[PDB]
Design a protein around this ligand. Structure first.
Ligand SMILES: Nc1ncnc2c1ncn2[C@@H]1O[C@H](COP(=O)(O)OP(=O)(O)OP(=O)(O)O)[C@@H](O)[C@H]1O
Ligand SMILES: Nc1ncnc2c1ncn2[C@@H]1O[C@H](COP(=O)(O)OP(=O)(O)O)[C@@H](O)[C@H]1O
Ligand SMILES: [Mg+2]
Ligand SMILES: [Mg+2]
Lengths: 475, 468, 473
């Protein structure tokens, strides 16, 4: 009864006779030892998705029921290890003796099981932490053209979580084995592997594994949240996850819709991204943040899969391929990038200075595009055109260089209040390094007060302590 | 009367019954099974009958996940459609698509249960009231006035501001009328739904409000029937109690896509862009029930997601025929920092007639739409030739259109986290007086930057003083 | 036997076994009492389209053939009332005591049964009656984007038929019950219900009723034509009627074509619109004119249903979303709109003045492509620009404001002969009303002569009488 016989095999899909008592979504075992999911239950046959190399499967082979819904191992044992989408090890460091297993498909927490998000997840990047705040429980999308730094923002985030009790998961979907190895070595060089789990389904792995990968990584992150701990998850590219589902759906002969993707494609990503949440105090107060990544062809942010994920997340960080070749980093387009959780998750000292900056850096784009020349505009327009240039310089920041929140507050207070208006634009970057080293070397009382109080009480000391640096042979 | 599961294909399940004991269309069926051994899983599931196929077989749509189902499982017929509680006991409660409570508050114990499918009011029961609902939002109150008892639709792509605009309307209208309120949240975010529930529970407004949700993560059966559960609860206050009510729906596009996902599995031929052949009929089954009659009134604010920013898509296209007012949100305005980002040239309402609004209101709105269209017709000429080559009249028209497009911007109370400003409410008199004063050229010697993010005209003038 | 039984039930479609002697298009009755049309005849089954609530029909139910074609009541008794697609009353004013019934499907009048259309159907709209004329037996299409003024032209046209022997039939297809009720109160407010019949298939009604609606409205219009009277028939939107047919055809499994529609869709609208005609004197001289409406998605006139109906009609009126927001209120594209019957439809007085207007506008359209610069354009080019701007202004008209043909003639005459050229562009609209009040209030003989003779030839007085107004106002 719990045994069937294969009737047809193809490019990762099979059909079998028998398996009468099989249940929708159950794991099934082939005589070769490979496994598959029972998706469709018909009058006389079962449709199976194979989770490995199918070239060893033939018609007439005996298939068997496992008696279990698709599940993955979870626990403390996965920290500092590399595994595939099925949770099996690929680092060569031996077996995993995990004590608990969890289904990869689960409903998200309800409206009452949640609570508002208020504790800031610092990224270390001045444009994100000021203009596009992130908090524990939020879902922020990283979007831009190929070769623009999307993986660098995710890896810089998984490293700034050094002196915090946050557990990081990185899910590689459709990536090259060489890029997976470069990410793992970068994490070991910075020590992030002491608190990280890596899940991989590379470009050469079957599309069925590239489909299960984000769900398996989510189940591992939920374990920490369900026990009151904090976790973070990265999805290296949801654009490749969608292509893998389009392949499986077209091979099952489901009718296509927009851009040949299946009608089910919204439910695919929305069922995964709504499991990221901050739970209520009765549930334990735990959290799970998400950082999905997407790739735009020629900057077409308006495409189906990109706008579809933007409609699910709590904010967007858009990266420009045009600004990147103009010597600008992180190259975030503030005129399009925004967050729905923003302002509330950020600390009070930062709310007091960053509040009006995004809308100012949006109208700045219009003015520089509209102003035909520099000699015909009036004094009222010249004054606001210059401010945006200086703020744009302050927002520039190199790779592998996290800046702490207390230092970000002092420099943004200087720019948003006009202290940089006499300094030339080419000297603004020298000012930022010289000013931060001056305050840390002889006024640690400003940075220490912001670190303990999280708010600006009296600015009088900072105005005078700042003016002293200006009088003392500034740039 | 019982039957058995014959097939399972994602959200769709086929069931076979006994000789002549077949259930009617839209009828609810129940699956209650306890695991007999360790290889099975416990299941509690509701199915809705969609069509008759022959061989004593019926095709159905599942309301929750079909994971764990096995061919041969026993199914029971309830004898009627999905039935939900109705009455004053439902006020201040949160509900699931099946009318079961989400909140930890206990059983509702209402006196009657109504079926989710009911015929709409006939032509002789319709109303023809022409009363202006003041919102306090400077762009809607001028260019697209909201009729009492009519439908107002918010159209926009991803992240343009539909939810921020709905929540500012909820705050401003539900404050002074003190009538019964309903919010459906068909595609509403669980995080936003939680932020809404906490504010309403602390402000006391929850005691007059019904909530139904039906989250993004749910299967299509729930995303398809949830808009009808909230509407069936709002209909009771109109029909049996004679009251005036507000019905909010954050997403009716999700209701259309849930029908599209279902259609291929039912065995139907697809139409344009892969949609179901029944799209206009299904939208009319929902929209014809949302009307004011001689017994009472239903006023509704709805948000419509526009996929890939294309308004020609079958779902947004089918919806425009049903609305009394239509607001379209533009990315070009949002990317430029102008919020709420409502497009002045595509937004309109039934009420914008010389017979329903004052001569001064009609003339100011006419002059605003015209100056913005003239400015839209010149951005090519200003790109090819220098601005010093345009005539004095066109030069003034550009400066006035520039001031007007940003004087249409306003800081909302529900947006203090994003705007960094307190929040403002503007009365109709100050909106009309404001635009007239700019159109007539009294404010030509004032910078464009002074008109951005100010509620009223007197504020723009002190904002100019705050800058030498 | 003549008894069939149901074997499948879906969204308004059912399939049955038996019914061996049923004929194509016959009405069939279900055991629940509801009715349906036998559209597809197969080797072993009949595809039935349901004309009511389908939720009461189940597999194994008995279905019987009626032996009758679909028919609707007709006569004078339908005037000033509102009915559904089957002719049943919905205004709440009681039963209808019509003495005759006519099938909704009948053949159009032949080539030899017709005569050329030579008499006008006044719309009261200066852009249509001067530049896009309508005769009393012509089919004219109203086409443009949503919210551009499509129903307003049809309703203003129905309101202008008060002092004329024309029965008006307004057919609402896929409209909201609330907009139907709002239009009916507007027709009563202006008194148009003293000669108007309203037929309505609401958006809530099954696709089969929205399919039958134009044919029923056409059958009611034909009764008046067959008895020597004049009739006008409006179809509020043929686009929703095509969508309703696409739904039934896809659910019945007929093979799709262009833009997902069935290949049969040209024959759907051509079998309808060719029934509008002016009969010969041997047949009685009666007439039926049609005003179908179509909605375009984002200005795409090249789409399937739009190009299909553009090829069937005798002329088209194009409405632009661009002109509408720019302050040209009726919003008609006069340089693109056309009627073949133009000239023959108009009266001798209107034609004469229409001609000069046509040349002036054509020249202005040629010049406006490069009108961007005007301080550099030659003074001669300016004469062409100035005249064209002023003729455009005369065409602007408020909703529900039909101008009588003698007044349209009197004002177009003034603009074309240069008498409105000297008036400032903004002041032209004011001057128009003031001049018409002056001509009617004192020396009304000009307006009386044009109504009787319909040919002018008396201009010396019109010129001298006009100079007395322009002397100080
Ligand atoms: N000549 C006019 N002058 C002023 N306003 C007008 C004029 N004609 C129409 N309008 C206004 O235009 C709006 C839309 O008119 P109407 O409903 O007839 O357009 P429509 O194209 O048929 O719209 P829909 O596609 O929704 O049916 C109404 O507010 C109407 O009052
Ligand atoms: N009125 C507004 N004022 C300021 N910011 C706004 C406003 N409307 C939209 N935004 C910004 O844009 C986003 C709008 O989110 P939301 O309303 O949910 O978008 P949508 O529902 O259209 O997808 C938020 O991140 C918010 O910061
Ligand atoms: Mg929203
Ligand atoms: Mg209309």
């Amino acid at each position: 009864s719990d045994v069937g016989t294969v009737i047809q095999v193809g490019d990762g899909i099979a059909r079998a006779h028998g398996l009468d008592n099989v249940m929708s979504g159950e794991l099934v075992e082939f005589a070769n030892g490979v496994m598959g999911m029972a998706l469709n239950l018909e009058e006389n046959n079962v449709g199976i998705v194979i989770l490995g190399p199918y070239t060893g499967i033939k018609e007439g082979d005996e298939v068997r029921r496992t008696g279990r819904i698709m599940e993955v191992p979870v626990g403390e044992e996965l920290i500092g290890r590399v595994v595939n989408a099925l949770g099996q090890p690929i680092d060569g460091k031996g077996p995993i003796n995990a004590k608990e297993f969890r289904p990869v498909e689960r409903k998200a927490p309800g409206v009452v099981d949640r609570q508002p998000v208020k504790e800031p997840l610092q990224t270390g990047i001045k444009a994100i932490d000021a203009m596009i705040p992130i908090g524990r429980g939020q879902r922020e999308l990283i979007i831009g053209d190929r070769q623009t730094g999307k993986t660098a923002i995710a890896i810089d985030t998984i490293i700034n979580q050094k002196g915090q009790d946050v557990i990081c998961i990185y899910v590689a979907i459709g990536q090259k084995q060489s890029t997976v190895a470069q990410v793992v070595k970068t994490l070991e060089e910075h020590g992030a592997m002491e608190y990280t789990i890596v899940v991989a389904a590379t470009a050469s792995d079957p599309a069925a594994l590239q489909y299960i990968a984000p769900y398996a990584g989510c189940a591992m992150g939920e374990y920490f949240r369900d026990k009151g701990k904090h976790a973070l998850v990265v999805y290296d590219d949801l654009s490749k996850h969608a292509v893998a589902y389009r392949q499986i759906s077209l091979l099952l002969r489901r009718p296509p819709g927009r851009e040949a993707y299946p009608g089910d494609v919204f439910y695919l990503h929305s069922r995964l991204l709504e499991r990221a949440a901050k739970l209520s105090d009765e549930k334990g107060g735990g959290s799970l943040t998400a950082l999905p990544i997407i790739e735009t062809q020629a900057g077409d942010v308006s495409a189906y899969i990109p706008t579809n994920v933007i409609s699910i997340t709590d904010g967007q960080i858009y990266l420009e391929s045009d600004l990147f070749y103009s010597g600008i980093r992180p190259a975030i387009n503030v005129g399009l990038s925004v967050s729905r959780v923003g302002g509330a998750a950020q600390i009070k000292a930062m709310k007091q200075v960053a509040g009006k900056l995004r809308l100012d850096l949006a109208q700045y784009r219009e003015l520089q595009a509209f102003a035909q020349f520099a000699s015909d505009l009036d004094e009222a327009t010249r004054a606001q055109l210059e401010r945006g240039q200086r703020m744009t310089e302050i927002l520039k920041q190199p790779q592998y260089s996290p800046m702490p929140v207390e230092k970000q507050v002092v420099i943004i207070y200087a720019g948003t209040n006009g202290y940089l208006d006499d300094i030339p634009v080419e000297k603004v970057k020298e000012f930022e390094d010289g000013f931060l080293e001056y305050i840390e070397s002889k006024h640690p009382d400003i940075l220490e007060e912001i670190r303990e109080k999280k708010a600006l009480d009296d600015e009088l000391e900072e105005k005078l302590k700042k003016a002293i640096k200006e009088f003392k042979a500034t740039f | 009367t019982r039957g058995r599961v014959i097939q399972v294909m994602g959200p769709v399940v086929d069931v076979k019954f006994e000789n002549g004991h077949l259930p009617a269309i839209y009828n609810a069926l129940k699956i209650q099974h306890k695991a007999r051994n360790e290889n099975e899983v416990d299941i509690d599931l509701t199915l809705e009958v969609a069509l008759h196929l022959g061989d004593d077989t019926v095709r159905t749509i599942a309301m929750a996940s079909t994971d764990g189902l096995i061919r041969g499982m026993e199914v029971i017929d309830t004898g009627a459609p999905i039935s939900v509680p109705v009455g004053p006991e439902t006020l201040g409660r949160m509900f699931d698509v099946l009318g079961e409570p989400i909140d930890e508050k206990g059983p509702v114990k209402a006196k009657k249960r109504w079926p989710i499918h009911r015929p709409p009011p006939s032509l002789s029961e319709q109303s023809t009231e022409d009363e202006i609902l003041e919102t306090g939002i400077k762009v809607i109150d001028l260019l697209a006035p909201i009729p009492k008892g009519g439908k107002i639709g918010l159209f926009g792509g991803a992240g343009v501001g539909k939810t921020v605009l709905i929540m500012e309307l909820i705050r401003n209208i539900a404050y002074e009328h003190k009538g019964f309120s309903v919010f459906a949240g068909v595609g509403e975010r669980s995080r936003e739904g939680n932020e809404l529930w906490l504010e309403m529970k602390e402000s006391g407004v929850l005691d007059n409000t019904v909530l139904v949700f039906g989250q993004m993560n749910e299967p299509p059966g729930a995303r398809f029937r949830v808009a009808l559960t909230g509407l069936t609860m709002a209909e009771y206050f109109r029909d049996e109690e004679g009251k005036d009510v507000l019905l909010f729906i954050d997403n009716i596009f999700r209701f259309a896509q849930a029908g599209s996902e279902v259609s291929a599995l039912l065995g139907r031929m697809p139409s344009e862009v892969g949609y179901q052949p029944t799209l206009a009929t299904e939208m009319a089954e929902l929209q014809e029930r949302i009307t004011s009659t001689r017994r009472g009134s239903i006023t509704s604010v709805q948000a419509i997601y526009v996929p890939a920013d294309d308004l020609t898509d079958p779902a947004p296209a089918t919806t425009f025929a049903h609305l009394d007012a239509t607001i379209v949100l533009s990315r070009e305005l949002a990317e430029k920092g102008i919020y709420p980002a409502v497009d002045p040239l595509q937004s309109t309402s039934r009420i914008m007639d010389p017979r329903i609004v004052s001569e001064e209101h009609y003339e100011v709105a006419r002059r605003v739409r015209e100056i913005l269209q003239r400015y839209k017709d010149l951005q090519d000429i200003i790109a090819i030739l220098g601005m010093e080559e345009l005539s004095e009249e066109d030069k003034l028209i550009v400066q006035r259109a520039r001031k007007i497009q940003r004087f249409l911007s306003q800081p909302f109370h529900v947006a203090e986290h994003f705007t960094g400003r307190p929040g403002k409410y503007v009365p109709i008199e100050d909106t009309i007086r404001g635009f007239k004063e700019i159109l007539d050229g009294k404010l030509d010697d004032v910078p464009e930057q002074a008109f951005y993010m100010v509620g009223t005209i007197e504020e723009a003038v002190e904002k100019a003083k705050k800058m030498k």
